[PDB]
Amino acid sequence: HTSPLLAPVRQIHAFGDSYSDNGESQRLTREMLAKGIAGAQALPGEVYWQGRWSNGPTAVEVLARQLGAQLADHAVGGAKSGADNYYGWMSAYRHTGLAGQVDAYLATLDGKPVDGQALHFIFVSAADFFEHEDFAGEQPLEQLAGSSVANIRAAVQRLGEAGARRFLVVSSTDLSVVPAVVAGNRVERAQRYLQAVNASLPIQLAALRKTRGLELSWFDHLTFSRHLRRNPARYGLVELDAPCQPTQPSVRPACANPDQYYFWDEWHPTRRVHQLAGEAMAARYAR
């Protein structure tokens, strides 16, 4: 039996990675390129919609529309759960990981309290895994997952410390079906990492919710995607595995029917999946 819906949301502060970013990586990388920062590249690049790492709005943008909330989206493509980014060259200009986004949000309040009614949305950890696999990190995956969990818990604790009361924390996504992971023959490694994050994180957040009297909702993105991918026709999806917009090894022309695709590029879902995800995330809240 379902429990009562949570109270309405009028403001979201979003923290996270390319699965949330609504233009910050684009703004920041244009700033970095203008300053001549070593190794800077324009992100996300040309085959993306208005600076989103997709062909349309991210899930948190759809969530805000569903709930009738304003969105302040701090997320940065590449953001890790700690201070920095998959793109190590950013560290010289700005700490854009979840911890860096939290620090910047708390430092820009301008002598105003944190809004205790605002929903603090946290969606991060994929870049921890992709960095580890792409650049041979030395942590066993179990230790990498423990650091991801610890980093996310520390972010909720630090936001709560400053006055945040309401949270929505997203689980690991199903990294094991991401086209770049399949092509890297890393499906088992992704399964092991995401299972360790998703078993431990909700246990840590439930303890912190009770200690600090938080409203904290956990969104199981893995259960969500398994249901979509087992019943694709129900949702108008046809192609679950091929990217609509190939980029590896090179950019090729986009598919004609993107709303029937799961993946936009080799890492990121389409606007269609972001829409279904944001609808699903809104399900715990009254409008």
Ligand SMILES: [Cl-]
């Ligand atoms: Cl990312």
